Design an enzyme around this catalytic site. Structure first.
Site: not given
Ligand SMILES: NC(=O)c1ccc[n+]([C@@H]2O[C@H](COP(=O)([O-])OP(=O)(O)OC[C@H]3O[C@@H](n4cnc5c(N)ncnc54)[C@H](OP(=O)(O)O)[C@@H]3O)[C@@H](O)[C@H]2O)c1
Ligand SMILES: N[C@@H](CCC(=O)N[C@@H](CSCO)C(=O)NCC(=O)O)C(=O)O
Ligand SMILES: CC(C)(C)n1nc(-c2cccc(O)c2)c2c(N)ncnc21
Ligand SMILES: CC(C)(C)n1nc(-c2cccc(O)c2)c2c(N)ncnc21
Length: 274
Positions: A60-61, A94, A103, A191, A193, A195
């Site tokens: 688990d990262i 979404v 989030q 999400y 950001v 990435k």
């Protein structure tokens, strides 16, 4: 002196398809990892029924002790690691009603900090001629274009350090908590950001490898797998998991002594401008 490849988030989706292809194309052992041991073991059983022989290790990262136990396993069993695919990641659906700041914190914790912790612990184990593939997203490029010019300059910088990047990623999360993220020049996609974080972290880590391990012929890149039918993207996406695996597998298996790509963002096996 058996070679070893490893995929994070390997029990389903793009990760599972990457494991399947590596079982066929990588000359050595392939380790499927999953955070949930039952889901990981079930995935191994599925691949065994297809005639393949992946190994399993829990990971688990988001649990540093889990990452460290995997690090120790790799050192003991293989003396290091040849191929690392950082595929694990999450996204809120979404218009999920979860408060945006939550989030932001949650997505960042896994996609950026988790990925970074895996790199911190496992990059030192990468053997000469090894390859590292970080699964990012075209959403990083889209999010980048929605950042302020000042933030775009910082994220495109050839001189940005890991610590500067971590500062910016935590700044996004903190700004969302304070109700100021738009004012401070951030995009609306948490999400996206995270990435940005993954893409820029890949650029930095590639620079560090060239600085610290010149001669070892290690190649490290970020990639977009395309829009893939998985539990994340849903059934409307255009690629199968098999098709989604093509670019990550390409980057994982770059021939020995290849000069590049290195520190690039790669989509459909092609280098994208950052
Ligand atoms: N269109 C797309 O599907 C698309 C496009 C561009 C980029 N990506 C990126 O591609 C990668 C794979 O996504 P996917 O579509 O295959 O999603 P998925 O079907 O949801 O699979 C995600 C995998 O990551 C694992 N994971 C999540 N959090 C983890 C953690 N903390 N530790 C270890 N494993 C964790 C999941 O484990 P669990 O089963 O236990 O949840 C699962 O094995 C992600 O990085 C995603 O951001 C996907
Ligand atoms: N509010 C979230 C949005 C994250 C998001 O975009 N989730 C998409 C996949 S990530 C690529 O955009 C998603 O879950 N799509 C399918 C669905 O909505 O059912 C944030 O800001 O991070
Ligand atoms: C050509 C590769 C190695 C990519 N490949 N792919 C697949 C394959 C075929 C269908 C689905 C899939 O996930 C993978 C395959 C196979 N079944 N037998 C032998 N080689 C195969
Ligand atoms: C919803 C749309 C179709 C815009 N979408 N979503 C995604 C998408 C879905 C899940 C994760 C992700 O990073 C991106 C996507 C993609 N990768 N390429 C092209 N279009 C994409």
């Amino acid at each position: 002196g058996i070679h070893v490849a490893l995929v994070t988030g390997g029990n389903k989706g793009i990760g599972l398809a990457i494991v399947r292809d590596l079982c066929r194309l990588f000359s050595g052992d392939v380790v499927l990892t999953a955070r949930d041991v039952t889901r990981g073991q079930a995935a191994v059983q599925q691949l065994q029924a297809e005639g393949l022989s992946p190994r399993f290790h829990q990971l688990d990262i988001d649990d540093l002790q889990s990452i460290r136990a995997l690090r120790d396993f790799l050192r003991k069993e293989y003396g290091g690691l040849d191929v690392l695919v950082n595929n694990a990641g999450i996204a809120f659906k979404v218009a999920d009603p979860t408060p945006f700041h939550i989030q932001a914190e949650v997505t960042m914790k896994t996609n950026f900090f988790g990925t970074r912790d895996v790199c911190t612990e496992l990059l030192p184990l990468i053997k000469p001629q090894g390859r590292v593939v970080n699964v990012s997203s075209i959403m990083s490029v889209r999010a980048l274009k929605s950042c302020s010019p000042e933030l775009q300059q910082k994220f495109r910088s050839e001189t940005i350090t890991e610590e500067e990047l971590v500062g910016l990623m935590n700044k996004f999360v903190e700004d969302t908590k304070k109700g100021v993220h738009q004012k401070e020049g951030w995009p609306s996609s948490a999400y996206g950001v995270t990435k940005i974080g993954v893409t820029v972290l890949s650029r930095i880590h590639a620079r560090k490898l060239s600085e610290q391990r010149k001669g070892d012929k290690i190649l490290l890149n970020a990639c977009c797998p395309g829009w893939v039918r998985t539990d994340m993207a849903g059934p409307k996406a255009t690629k199968s998991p098999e098709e989604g695996a093509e670019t990550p597998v390409y980057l994982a298996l770059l021939p020995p002594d290849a000069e590049g790509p290195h520190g690039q963002f790669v989509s459909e096996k092609r280098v994208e401008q950052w």
